[PDB]
Amino acid sequence: PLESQYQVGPLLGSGGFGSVYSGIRVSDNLPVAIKHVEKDRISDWGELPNGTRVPMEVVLLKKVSSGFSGVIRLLDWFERPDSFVLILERPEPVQDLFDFITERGALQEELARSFFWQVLEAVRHCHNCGVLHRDIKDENILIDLNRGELKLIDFGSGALLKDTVYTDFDGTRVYSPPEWIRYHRYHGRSAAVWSLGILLYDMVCGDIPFEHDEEIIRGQVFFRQRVSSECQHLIRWCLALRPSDRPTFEEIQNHPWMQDVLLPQETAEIHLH
Ligand SMILES: C[C@H]1NC(=O)c2cc(-c3cccc4c(=O)n(C5(C)CC5)c(NC5(C)CC5)nc34)[nH]c21
Numbered sequence: 141p142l143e144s145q146y147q148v149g150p151l152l153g154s155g156g157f158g159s160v161y162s163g164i165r166v167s168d169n170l171p172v173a174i175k176h177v178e179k180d181r182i183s184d185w186g187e188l189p190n191g192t193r194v195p196m197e198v199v200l201l202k203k204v205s206s207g208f209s210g211v212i213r214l215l216d217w218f219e220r221p222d223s224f225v226l227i228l229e230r231p232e233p234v235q236d237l238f239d240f241i242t243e244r245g246a247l248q249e250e251l252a253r254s255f256f257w258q259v260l261e262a263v264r265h266c267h268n269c270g271v272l273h274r275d276i277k278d279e280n281i282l283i284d285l286n287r288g289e290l291k292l293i294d295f296g297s298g299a300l301l302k303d304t305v306y307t308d309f310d311g312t313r314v315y316s317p318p319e320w321i322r323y324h325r326y327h328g329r330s331a332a333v334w335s336l337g338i339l340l341y342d343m344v345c346g347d348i349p350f351e352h353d354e355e356i357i358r359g360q361v362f363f364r365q366r367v368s369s370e371c372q373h374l375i376r377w378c379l380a381l382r383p384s385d386r387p388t389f390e391e392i393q394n395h396p397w398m399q400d401v402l403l404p405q406e407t408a409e410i411h412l413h
Pocket of ligand 1: 152153154157160172173175212228229230231234235236279280282293294295296
């Protein structure tokens, strides 16, 4: 089932998420990624309409893999005795945003605007399909280097979107909002907007703004790089201490700093090729 249909290549990476290998679908040589997760290392489980116990990530990816998007597509999945295996699409050539930022340092605002806009479109798509990622960060974003298109990855910390409080969190701490640090309580959209503020700061400054819990709680933003006043304003708004003071996704995309975004292909020509 798995062995015959996919030819396995080298390990791309491993960590809390499991182990991800490059691969190729044997039938048509389609590039793929193959994610293995041990059953013991999965805490968040869900059920398919069919009535089958699977990892939540499988439920979430099926809900968002409908149509095209800036979300990594689940092509197939398999259950094994002690693990689940997910077959994901693989752009070629590709680089993850963390490595891209590390190599360039801070991104030019024009580039950060295009990237951030695409992340916003992808996150909006997730929320429309009832899915909350809960771990938005540069490490969970891939760049299709030829087309200039960003793709969200790793829904292993995610959940079904709801309007009530979340009391569990498995995402990355330094991207987590002050309300989680202080009260172990947050709401979906406003916590997501906090992580987007951290991401945007990361793009235009070349690193995250807060390291320790006390910096997150204080919420004072210091700019280490030259950043436009409009971009600083949007960042500070996303990082409002009070969740209800943070912008909606609509307010983010109507912010003056977000106007006249480049198309992804233009973005590649000017900034990537
Ligand atoms: C972060 C990890 N967790 C996931 O769910 C997932 C999916 C991928 C993944 C999917 C498709 C393509 C790539 C890919 O090309 N790469 C590269 C080799 C371009 C960086 C990587 N690198 C990572 C983030 C694993 C270390 N992951 C992919 N990586 C992860």
